[PDB]
Amino acid sequence: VWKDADTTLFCASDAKAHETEVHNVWATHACVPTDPNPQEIHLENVTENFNMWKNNMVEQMQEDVISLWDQSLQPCVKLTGGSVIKQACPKISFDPIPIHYCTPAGYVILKCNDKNFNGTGPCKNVSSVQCTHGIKPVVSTQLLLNGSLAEEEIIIRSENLTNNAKTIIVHLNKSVEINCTRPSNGDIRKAYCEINGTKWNKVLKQVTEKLKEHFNNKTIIFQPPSGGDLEITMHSFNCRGEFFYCNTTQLFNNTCINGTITLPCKIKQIINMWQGTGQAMYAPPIDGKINCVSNITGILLTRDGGANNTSNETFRPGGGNIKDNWRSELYKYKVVQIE
Ligand SMILES: N[C@H]1Cc2ccccc2[C@@H]1NC(=O)C(=O)Nc1ccc(Cl)c(F)c1
Ligand SMILES: *[C@@H]1O[C@H](CO)[C@@H](O)[C@H](O)[C@H]1NC(C)=O
Ligand SMILES: *[C@@H]1O[C@H](CO)[C@@H](O)[C@H](O)[C@H]1NC(C)=O
Ligand SMILES: *[C@@H]1O[C@H](CO)[C@@H](O)[C@H](O)[C@H]1NC(C)=O
Ligand SMILES: *[C@@H]1O[C@H](CO)[C@@H](O)[C@H](O)[C@H]1NC(C)=O
Ligand SMILES: *[C@@H]1O[C@H](CO)[C@@H](O)[C@H](O)[C@H]1NC(C)=O
Ligand SMILES: *[C@@H]1O[C@H](CO)[C@@H](O)[C@H](O)[C@H]1NC(C)=O
Ligand SMILES: *[C@@H]1O[C@H](CO)[C@@H](O)[C@H](O)[C@H]1NC(C)=O
Ligand SMILES: *[C@@H]1O[C@H](CO)[C@@H](O)[C@H](O)[C@H]1NC(C)=O
Ligand SMILES: *[C@@H]1O[C@H](CO)[C@@H](O)[C@H](O)[C@H]1NC(C)=O
Ligand SMILES: *[C@@H]1O[C@H](CO)[C@@H](O)[C@H](O)[C@H]1NC(C)=O
Ligand SMILES: *[C@@H]1O[C@H](CO)[C@@H](O)[C@H](O)[C@H]1NC(C)=O
C-alpha cells in the first residue's frame, strides 16, 4: 500500500574520479555509484495516475543541473540583479553523462510501461524501481538531443493541447543525427550543422500525421518562430563547452513534407542564462575543429493561436523552459511513499 508523495532524492552515476570532465567531477562528489544489479517489480492489475507536468522529480533534476553548471561553467561577466561579477573564465572539458535518480528508504519509484503513454492519466502496466534510467542533462532549445526514443509510435505530449500557450513535446520513435562543426583553419564563431534531408523530412512527415490524430485531421503547417530571444528563435545547445546557436528555417519546411541540409550556426559568448539569472558573457571558443554529433530524439513546439475558424494548425519550434527537457525523460516516473 502506497500513496503519492515528494521526498529528497539522491543521484547515482558511473562517473570516473580521475576525469577532469565537469559532469564527471560533479557526479563524483554529488552522486553514488550505480547499482550493478538493479531490481524491477512488475505490478499486477494496478492502475496508477501520472502527471508529467506536475512532477517534483523534474524540479529536483533542474536544481542539480543548475548546481552543476554554476560550479562548472564560469562566464567572464555575470550580470544578475544589478550586480556585476567579473571572474576567471577558463576553458573546460564538457560532455554530459547519464544521471540516475533514486528514492531513499520508505519510498519507491513507480514506472509507467504503457507503450503509447502520453505522460498524463492512468497507466495499466506499472512497475516499481529504486532508480530511474540514466538521463543525460542535455540543455537545449527547439530540438531535444541524445535522449531516449519512444518504443512504438511517435508520442505527442502536452499539459493541455487545446491551450496554445502550453508547450508541446514531440517524442520521436526514430532518431535523426545532427552533425555540428566549427571548422579548423577566418570567422572563429562561424559554424554549421548537417542533417540528412531524406531522413529528417520522412520523420517530420510522420510527426504531421501524428499531430493530425490529435487535432481532428486539420492541416498541419510548420513555420519559423515569430520572435523573441535568440535562445528561442534558434536551436541553441552546448558543444564542448561552447554555446551554439543554429538557424532551423530549413528543418521546418512544409514544401519538403532530399540531400544534405546545412544549417548556419554561430558560437555566442553573450547569452541569456537558462538558469533565469539574467545575462552572461562566456569565454571565446577554443582553437581547432569543434564538433558534436547528436541524436535528435524530440521536438519542442508551440502552436499558433487564432486558427479556430480555419482548417489549419500552425506549429513553430520553441520551448526554452529547460524543465521541459527533463520532463521528456522523467514523464514515466513518479515517487510514492510506502505506508
Ligand atoms: N528566462 C529563461 C527561463 C525561462 C522560463 C520559461 C520560458 C523561457 C525561459 C528563458 N530561457 C532561456 O533564457 C534559455 O533557455 N537560454 C539558453 C542558454 C543556453 C543554452 Cl545552450 C540554451 F539551450 C538555452
Ligand atoms: C501492457 O503489458 C502487456 C504485457 O507486456 C502488453 O502486451 C501490452 O501492450 C501493455 N499495454 C500497453 C498499453 O502498453
Ligand atoms: C544515437 O542514436 C543511435 C540509434 O538510436 C543510438 O544507438 C545511439 O546510442 C545514439 N547515441 C547517443 C545516445 O548519443
Ligand atoms: C514511428 O511511429 C509511427 C507512428 O507514429 C509509425 O508509423 C512508424 O512505423 C514508427 N517508426 C518506427 C521506426 O518504428
Ligand atoms: C493523454 O491521455 C489521457 C487519457 O488517458 C487524455 O486525457 C489526454 O488528453 C492525453 N494527452 C494527450 C496529449 O493526448
Ligand atoms: C485546456 O485549455 C483550454 C483553452 O485554454 C481551456 O478552455 C480548458 O479549460 C483547458 N482544460 C483543462 C483541463 O484545464
Ligand atoms: C560530421 O560532418 C563532417 C563533415 O562536416 C564529417 O567529416 C563527419 O564524418 C561527420 N560525422 C558523422 C558522424 O557523420
Ligand atoms: C540519408 O538517409 C537515407 C535514408 O533516409 C539513407 O539511405 C542515405 O544513405 C542517407 N544519405 C547519406 C549521405 O548518408
Ligand atoms: C482522420 O481521418 C481519418 C480518415 O482516414 C478518420 O478515420 C479519423 O477518424 C480522423 N480523425 C480525426 C480525429 O478527425
Ligand atoms: C534564419 O535564416 C533565414 C534565411 O536566411 C532568415 O530569413 C531568418 O531571419 C533566420 N532566422 C533567425 C532567427 O535569424
Ligand atoms: C524548402 O524547400 C524548398 C524546396 O524547393 C526550397 O526551395 C526552400 O528554400 C526550402 N526552405 C528553406 C531552405 O528554408
Ligand atoms: C550527444 O552524444 C554524443 C555521444 O556521446 C556526443 O558526442 C555529443 O556531444 C552529444 N551532444 C550534445 C549536445 O551533448
Q: How was this structure determined?
A: X-ray
C-alpha angle 87-63-23 in degrees, rounded to nearest 5: 65
| C-beta pairs of 153-162 under 8 Å, 24+ apart in sequence | 153/116, 153/210, 154/206, 154/207, 154/210, 155/116, 155/117, 155/118, 155/119, 155/210, 156/118, 156/210, 156/211, 156/214, 157/52, 157/118, 157/119, 157/327, 157/328, 157/331, 159/53, 159/120, 161/214, 161/215
Cell for 15?
A: 562517473
Domain assignments of the chain as residue spans, ordered by start = 1-339
C-alpha angle 18-290-234 in degrees, rounded to nearest 5: 115
Residue written as cell 573564465? 89
Three-class secondary structure of residue 86 per DSSP = strand
Among protein residues, the one whose CA lies closest to atom 3 of ligand 11: 255
Among protein residues, the one whose CA lies closest to atom 12 of ligand 10: 247
Task: Give CA–CA dist 200/319, Å, rounded.
Answer: 20
C-alpha angle 27-33-37 in degrees, rounded to nearest 5: 145
Helix axes 323-330, 56-72, angle to 10 degrees: 130
C-alpha distances in Å from residue 211, one per residue of 208, 219, 222, 329 = 5, 9, 11, 20
C-alpha distances in Å from residue 124, one per residue of 43, 148, 153, 261 = 9, 21, 18, 42
The data reach a resolution, in angstroms, of: 1.8
C-alpha angle 255-157-135 in degrees, rounded to nearest 5: 105
Q: Residue 306 C-alpha to ligand 9 middle, in angstroms?
A: 23
Residue 109: CA count within 13 A, CB half-sphere: 26
291 DSSP β-pair partners:
181
Neighbouring C-beta atoms of residue 321, cutoff 10 Å = 15
Task: Give CA–CA dist 61/258, Å, rounded.
Answer: 39
C-alpha angle 81-271-93 in degrees, rounded to nearest 5: 110
Handedness of CA 162, 165, 167, 170 (dihedral sign): positive
Q: Are 260 and 181 in contact (CB under 8 A)?
A: no
- Which of 105, 169, 106 shows the shortest CA–CA distance to 319? 169
Cβ 222 under 6 angstroms from ligand 12: no
Cβ 250 under 6 angstroms from ligand 11: yes
Q: Residue 216 C-alpha to ligand 9 middle, in angstroms?
A: 7
φ, ψ (nearest 5 deg) of residue 296: -75, 120
Task: Give CA–CA dist 150/144, Å, rounded.
Answer: 13
Among protein residues, the one whose CA lies closest to atom 3 of ligand 12: 294
CATH assignment, 1-339: 2.170.40.20
Cell for 58?
A: 523534474
Cell for 187?
A: 570567422
- Which of 57, 147, 136 shows the shortest CA–CA distance to 103? 57
Three-class secondary structure of residue 310 per DSSP = coil
Q: Are 200 and 178 in contact (CB under 8 A)?
A: no
- Which of 243, 249, 221 shows the shortest CA–CA distance to 231? 243
Q: Residue 116 C-alpha to ligand 2 middle, in angstroms?
A: 10
Q: Residue 214 C-alpha to ligand 5 middle, in angstroms?
A: 10
Task: Give CA–CA dist 268/307, Å, rounded.
Answer: 36
Tell me which residues have their CB closer than 6 angstroms to ligand 8.
Answer: 196, 198-199, 202
Nearest atom (ligand 11) to Cα of 253: 1
> What residues contact residue 291 under an 8 Å CB cut-off, 6+ apart?
179, 180, 181, 182, 239, 240
Tell me which residues have their CB closer than 6 angstroms to ligand 10.
Answer: 233-234, 247, 249
Residue 238: CA count within 13 A, CB half-sphere: 18
- Burial readout 19-51 (b: 16 or more C-beta within 10 A, e: otherwise): eebbbbbbbeebbeebeeeeeeeeeeeeebebe
Q: Are 324 and 167 in contact (CB under 8 A)?
A: yes
Task: Give CA–CA dist 184/309, Å, rounded.
Answer: 52
φ, ψ (nearest 5 deg) of residue 171: -105, 105
Cβ 4 under 6 angstroms from ligand 7: no
